[PDB]
Amino acid sequence: MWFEILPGLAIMGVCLVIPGVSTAYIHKFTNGGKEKRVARVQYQWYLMERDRRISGVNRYYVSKGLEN
Amino acid sequence: GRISAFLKNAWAKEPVLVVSFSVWGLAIIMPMISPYTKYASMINKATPYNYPVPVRDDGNMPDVPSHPQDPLGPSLDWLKNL
Amino acid sequence: RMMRWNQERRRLLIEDLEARIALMPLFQAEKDRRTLQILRENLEEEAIIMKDVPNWKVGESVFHTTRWVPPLIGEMYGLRTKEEMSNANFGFTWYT
Amino acid sequence: MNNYIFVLSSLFLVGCLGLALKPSLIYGGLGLIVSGFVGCLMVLGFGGSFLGLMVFLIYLGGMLVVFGYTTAMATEEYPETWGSNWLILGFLVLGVIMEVFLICVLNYYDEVGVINLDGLGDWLMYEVDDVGVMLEGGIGVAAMYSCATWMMVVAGWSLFAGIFIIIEITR
Amino acid sequence: PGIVELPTLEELKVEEVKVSSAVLKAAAHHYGAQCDKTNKEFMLCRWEEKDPRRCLKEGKLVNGCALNFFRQIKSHCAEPFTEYWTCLDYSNMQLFRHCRQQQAKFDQCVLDKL
Amino acid sequence: MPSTFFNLTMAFSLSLLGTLMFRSHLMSTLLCLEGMVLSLFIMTSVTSLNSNSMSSMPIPITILVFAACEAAVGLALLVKVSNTYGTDYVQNLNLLQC
Amino acid sequence: MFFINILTLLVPILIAMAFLTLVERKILGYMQLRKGPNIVGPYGILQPFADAMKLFMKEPSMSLFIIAPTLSLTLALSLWVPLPMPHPLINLNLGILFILATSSLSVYSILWSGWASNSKYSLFGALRAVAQTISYEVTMAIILLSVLLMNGSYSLQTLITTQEHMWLLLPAWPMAMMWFISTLAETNRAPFDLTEGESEEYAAGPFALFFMAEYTNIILMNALTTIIFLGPLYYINLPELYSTNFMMEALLLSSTFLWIRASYPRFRYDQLMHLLWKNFLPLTLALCMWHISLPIFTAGVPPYM
Amino acid sequence: MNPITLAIIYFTIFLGPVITMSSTNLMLMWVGLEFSLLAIIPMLINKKNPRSTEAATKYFVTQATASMIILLAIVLNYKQLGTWMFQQQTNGLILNMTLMALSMKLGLAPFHFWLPEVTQGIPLHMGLILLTWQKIAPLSILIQIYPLLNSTIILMLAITSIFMGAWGGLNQTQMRKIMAYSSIAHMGWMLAILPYNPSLTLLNLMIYIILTAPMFMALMLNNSMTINSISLLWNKTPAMLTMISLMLLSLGGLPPLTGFLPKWIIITELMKNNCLIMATLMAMMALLNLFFYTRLIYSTSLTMFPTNNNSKMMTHQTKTKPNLMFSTLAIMSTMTLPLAPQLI
Amino acid sequence: PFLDIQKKLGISLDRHFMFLSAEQPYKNAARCHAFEKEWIECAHGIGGTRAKKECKIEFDDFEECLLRYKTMRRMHDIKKQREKLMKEGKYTPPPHHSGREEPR
Amino acid sequence: MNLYTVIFINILLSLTLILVAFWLPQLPFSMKFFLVAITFLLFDLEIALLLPLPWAIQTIKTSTMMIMAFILVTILSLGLAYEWTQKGLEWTE
C-alpha cells in the first residue's frame, strides 16, 4: 500500500537535507565556530579588511577582544 | 437599479474584473483616509543613513543641545510608543 | 502582524546605525593616518627611484590648487603588489 | 585576474565585429548573446550589480528572445552559404591580427593615454565610500520615483504609444 | 607646478586600539556619549578643513579617550563584556537581536558600578 | 578604464559598419543596431559608476527602453515586408526610383 | 572545502531527481490504483540507474545539438547556488533576479532546437511553448516584485528573518495561488504540458538531459515556494531543523504537482493564454498596487541594511 | 487607425519636438527625436501597400543610425566633462558627428538620397508633416549650439545640397519629389547662414513652411501628383492658379514676392562676414529651382493642356474642402515683403 | 536654452541634474564636486568666450580630477624606471612595498 | 572566483555526460505570435521601470512614489484593455 513510497521519500529527504547542514558546518569549520560574515555594503567589508589587517595572521576569523 | 442589476450580473459572469477594480479603488483611496500614513515619511526621515555633522556656538541659538543624551533636541518617542 | 514586525525591524536598524554613527569618527582618523603614511612611503621611495633623471620633481602636485585631494587607490597601492591592488578593487565585488 | 576588464572588452569587441561581418543570423545571434553576457560582466566587475542583472533579465530574456522568435517565424536561411561563414571566419582572423598588432603599435606612441599596459590593473576604481551605505546603482535607478520623474513618465508614454503603434502597423 | 606638504611616518605614530569590529560595535552605544565631545570636535575640524594633514592633533586625543574608556571597561565588568562579543560575533551581520538577555546584564553591571 | 572604453567605442564603430554595409538581409542590420545600443548603455553606466554619480543613472534605462521599442517597430516593418513580398531580402526594394 | 560543498550541492540533488522520477511513477500508480515499479530492486530503487544506463546505451548541427541541453542543465544547476539552507552557499543581493534570468534563458535552447529542425511541425510547438513560457515568467517576476516590498531588499536571507514570527501565505495568498501555477508553465508540467501532448527532435542522451533539468527546475521552484511563502523556523542553533522543515515542505509541494498531473486534463493553448491575459494579469497588477500602498497607509515600510 | 490611436499618435508627434526644444538635456532631445520617428512611421505606412512599407523601412533605418550616432556624441561628452550638455570645450570630432547625424536626419546632402523615394511613396497629408514638423527639433538642437560649430563643413554641406537638389529638380516630374528637392535646397540656405545669425534660419524655415503647406493643401485637393495631372486644374477648378503661380515664383525667390527676402538678408550677413564667394554660388544656383518652378507655372496657368472629357461630369459637381488658412498663408507669403523689418 | 518654458514657470524637470555636483539622493557627493563648484562659479555671471579663456586654471584642474591623464603618466614613468632599475640590478624593494608590513 | 568555479564545474559535468552519451555506444506567419512577443517586451520594460521600488520606497516623497506607481500600472492596464477590445487576445483567424 501507500507505505511503499518511503524508500524514495526518505531518500530524497536526506539528499535534500545534506546540502544545508553541509554548507553550515563547513563554513563553521573554516571560520572557526562562527558563521561566514556577509557584506551587503562597503561598511562590513571595511570591518572585515580591518580585522584581516590586525589579525596578525592575515585572516579575519580571529576576534581579539581586550588583550591587544 | 441598472447599476445594481449590472453588478449582480458581473458578480457571477466575470468577477475577476470586479475584484481587480475594487482592489484598485481601495489602493487609490485608503492612503487619503488612514491616519498612519505620514508616520512613514517621519520614520524614513528619522533613519540616519549618514552622519549628522555638528555646528559651532558663536551665537545664542538655544534650541540645539550641547550633548546627544540631553533633551533639548527633536524627539521621536512616539516611535517606541507606537 | 507584518506591520507590527516591520516597525520593530526599523527600530533595530536605527540601533545599528547609531552604533555606526558613534564609531565613524575613530575610523575616519585611522583611515586618514593610514593613507598619509602610505603616501609618505610612496614618496620616500619615489625619491631614490627617480632621482637620477633630469628636470623631475618630488611630490609635484599636478594641480595648481593647494587644496587637499582624495588620492586614488592607483596612487596609493600603485607600487604594492597585484595582491593588494585587487584585494582593494574586487573585494566587495567578488563575494567577500 | 588583473586583465579581467581588458579581456571582457576584447570579447565585446569581437562580438560586435562578428555582427558587423554579417554572418548567417543563426551564428550571429550567438555572438550577440555573448556580447551582452560579457558587457554585463564588465558592468558587474565595475560594481553595477543592479544594472547587470537588469540587462540579463531584459536584454536577453526580453529582446533576443523575440529577435530569434521573429527571425525563425519570418525568415529562411536560403543557401547563401557558399562557404561564406568559412571565408568571413578567416577574414575575422585577419582583422583580429590587425587589431592585436594595432594595439601593440599604439602602446608605443601613446603610453599614459589610450592604454597603460605596464599597470593595466590600476585605474578602474578611483575613489569609494569605505564607510558608506546606500551607494549602489539601485538608488540612482530608483531616483525616477522621487526626482527625475520625467524619465519615468516619458518611458511610460513611449510604451503607451508603442502598443498602439505596433497594432496599427501589423494590420 | 607646486610642491605638496606631508607629515612624516616617524610622527603621527600613536598606539592604536587594534580591537575587533565586534567589540567596537558592542561597546559603541556607551562610547556614543562617553568620549563624544572629542569625536564631535574632530568631525567638525574635518568637515570645516579638508586638510587631514591639519586635523591630526584631534585624532590622538580621540584614540587616547577610547583607550582610557576600554581601560575602565577592562577594570570593571570584563567577563560580561567578553561573553557579549563572543555571542555577537557568532552571527553573520552581528545584530543586536540574538543577544538581548546577554546585554541587559552587562548594562546593569556597568550601571551599578558606574 | 580607458582601454576598455576605447574598445567599446571600436565595437560601436564596427556595428556602424555593419549597419552601413549590407549582405542581403535586414535582421543583420537591426541586430547591429542592438549591438550599438548595448555598447552605449554600457559606456554610460560605466561612466556613471566610475564618477560615483547616481542621479545620472536613469539615462541607460531610458535609452534601453527606447531602443527596445525602436527595434520592435523595426521588426514589425520587416514582418510586413516579408508578408507582402515573400521574404526579407533587400534587393526587392527597387521601387520608388521613379 | 569549496569543491566539497559544490559536490554536496550537486551530487545529492541528482540523486534526489532520480528518486523523484521514481516517486512520481509510484504515486501516479497508487492513484491509478496500481503499484508501480517494485521489481528491479527493493521497492524500485534501481529503475533510475537502469534508465540512465539504457539511455547512454542507445545510439543516436552538433553546435546546437550540444549547447542546448548543456545550457539548460547548467542553468538549472546554477539556480541552486544562492539558496539559503539556512546559510547559503553564495549570498547574493538580487539573488532572485539572478534566479529569474537563469530560468528564462532555457527558452534559447527550446528555440535553437526548432530553428535547427526544419520540421514546420516542430517550429509549431516550439513557438507555442516558448510563448506560454515567456508569458508566465512575466507574472512569475511580478509576483516577487509585489511581495518583496515586505522586505526592502532583493536578497534571499532577509526572507527568513522576516518570516521569523509569521509566514508569508496568510497574506499574499492571492499570489501563492498563482506562483503555485506559473511554476506549472515554465516547467511545462500539467495542466500545461501540451508541449509534450501534441506530437506528430530529442535523442536519448539529450532527452535525458532535458528531463534532468525539467525535474531539477521542479524541485527548485518548489523550494523557492517553501522559502518565500512558507517561511521555515530559523532558530539559529538549529540550521539542521531549518533544512529539515524545508525538506518536508519541498516534498509536499513536489507531491502536489503529482496529485495534479494525475487528476486534471490539459489546457487548450488558446484557453491557456486567455487564462493568463484575462484573469491573472489584471489581478496581478492590482495586487501589486495593493502591496505598494500597504506600506504607505501602514507604517510597515521595511529597511535596507 | 481608429480615433483613439489617431489622437495618441498626433499627440506624440506634437510632443516630440516640444520636449526636444523645451528640454536642456541632450538625452531628452534624443528622446523627442525618437518620439517623432516612432509616432510618424504608422502615418506613413497606414495604406499598408508595398511602397509605403519600403519607404518606412528606409526612413526608420536612416533615422535610427542617426539617433544612435547622436547618442554616441552625448556619451563621449559625458565621459569628457561630466555634464549632459554641450559646452565650448568638446573635441570637434564630436560636433562633426552630431552634425553628420542631424543632417542625415534632416535631408541635407549627400545624406539626402532617401528623401525623394520616401516622399514619393507617401501620400500628401503625411509628406507635409515629414517636411514641416520633423525638421524643427533637429534645428533647435543647432540653434542651441551654433557658436562652436565647424563653418567649413557646414558650408560645404549646404552648397552641396543646393547643387544636388537643383540638379535633381530639373528632371523630377513627380511634384512630391520636386517639393522634396526644394526642401533640401532651402535647408541648405539655412545651414549656410546658421552659425552667423540663427533667427535667419528660423525665418527661412517659417517661410518655406508657409509656402509648402498651402501647396500641399492644393494637392490634397485633387490627389494630382504629376504635371500632366495638375495641368487639368484650369478645367477642374480654375481658381487655385492665381495663387499657385505666385507661391511657386515665391519659393523660387523672385524679388517682389517674399521668398526673395531670406536669400537677400542671408547674402547680406555672409557679405558682412566675408563669404561672398559661396554667397555668389548660392545666388547663381537658386535659378534652377526658379526654372523648374517656372516650368510648372507654364503647364498649369500660362498655357492650357488637353483635358479629359469626364471632367465635365466632375464640374457638374461641387467641392468645399479648401479651408481659409490656405489662402491666408498664401497671401501672408506673397504680399508681405513691405514687412521685413517687422519680421527681423 | 531655446524655449524657456521651464524658467517661465519657475520649475525644473531635467535641469536639476544636468551636471555632476547636483543634489545626489543620500548626500553621497561625486568625485570632482569641488572643482565643479569652482568652475561653475567662475563661469557664472559671464557668458562663454570670457570663460573659455579666464577659467582654464579652474577647468584643467577639473578635467584632471576627472581623468588624471597627468597622474597616470607620472605613475607610469615611475614604474618604468623602477622596472629598468630592478633589471640592471640596482634596486631592492623594501618590505612595505614588497609584500608585508605592520599595519593598523 | 567562486561563481566561476561553480559554473565551470556545472558545464564540465554536463559535457562529461554528453561525451558519455556519444562514446558509450562504441512556414507562413501568424501575426498573433509577433503581437504576443511585442506584449512581452512592452511588459518587460515596465518591469525594468518598476523593480526599484524596494529602494524608492524608503525615500521621503511617498506622495510621489505612490502616485507614479499607480500611474504606470493604470496606463499599462489601459493599453492592455485597448488591445483586448481591439482583439489582440482572441487567437481566432
Author numbering:
A (entry chain a): 1 to 68
B (entry chain b): 2 to 83
C (entry chain Z): 48 to 143
D (entry chain J): 1 to 171
E (entry chain X): 1 to 114
F (entry chain K): 1 to 98
G (entry chain H): 1 to 60, 67 to 206, 214 to 318
H (entry chain N): 1 to 344
Provide passages from the article that reported this PDB entry.
This reversal of the normal electron transfer reaction causes a substantial increase in complex I-mediated production of superoxide, which is then dismutated to H2O2 by Mn-superoxide dismutase in the matrix, and termed here “ROS production by RET”. Furthermore, mitochondrial ROS production contributes to the tissue damage associated with cardiac ischemia–reperfusion (IR) injury.
To determine how the ND6-P25L mutation affects the structure of complex I, the complex (ND6-P25L-CI) was isolated from the heart mitochondria of ND6-P25L mice, and its structure determined by single-particle electron cryomicroscopy (cryo-EM). The final cryo-EM density map reached a global resolution of 3.8 Å from 26,638 particles in the final reconstruction. The map revealed a fully intact complex matching WT-CI with all 45 subunits clearly present and was described using a model containing 8063 residues (96% of the total) developed from models for the WT enzyme. The variant residue is located at the very start of ND6-TMH2 (on the matrix side of the membrane), pointing towards ND6-TMH3. In ND6-P25L-CI, TMH2 leans away from TMH3, relative to in WT-D (and WT-A), increasing the distance between them. Most likely this occurs because of destabilizing steric interactions between the variant Leu sidechain on ND6-TMH2 and residues at the end of ND6-TMH3 and the start of the adjacent ND4L-TMH2, notably ND4L-Met27. The structure of the ND6-P25L complex indicates how replacing the Pro residue with a Leu pushes ND6 TMHs 2 and 3 apart, allowing the upper section of TMH3 to rotate more easily and facilitating the spontaneous transition into D-like states. On the molecular level, ND6-P25L complex I functions normally for NADH oxidation but is incapable of catalyzing reverse electron transport.
